[PDB]
């Protein structure tokens, strides 16, 4: 729970850092990443899979390790 919490704190830190809001992600990604889904990752309310995390890190353009708590 705490881990999920802190993981989502970084998922948010990277997203906002490149100036994108949650709606921004859904739009730029042509709908592959739904704001709803990404938000729930950022609040630790929904658990991302390691696979899925790997793709996000790619979409954002950062080393996937960096998103780990």
Numbering used by the authors: 3 to 71
Q: Which passages does the manuscript contain on this structure?
A:
Here, we report that c-di-GMP can assemble into a tetramer that mediates the effective dimerization of a transcription factor, BldD, which controls the progression of multicellular differentiation in sporulating actinomycete bacteria. BldD is an 18 kDa DNA-binding protein consisting of two distinct domains connected by a flexible linker. BldD sits at the top of the regulatory cascade controlling development, serving to repress expression of sporulation genes during vegetative growth (den Hengst et al., 2010).
The N-terminal domain is the DNA-binding domain (DBD) and has a xenobiotic response element (XRE) helix-turn-helix (HTH) DNA-binding motif (Kim et al., 2006). Our data and those of others (Lee et al., 2007a) show that the BldD DBD alone can dimerize at higher concentrations (≥10 μM). Consistent with these findings, the crystal structure of the S. coelicolor BldD DBD revealed a dimer with a small contact interface (Kim et al., 2006). These data indicate that the BldD DBD is unlikely to form a stable DNA-binding active dimer at physiologically relevant concentrations.
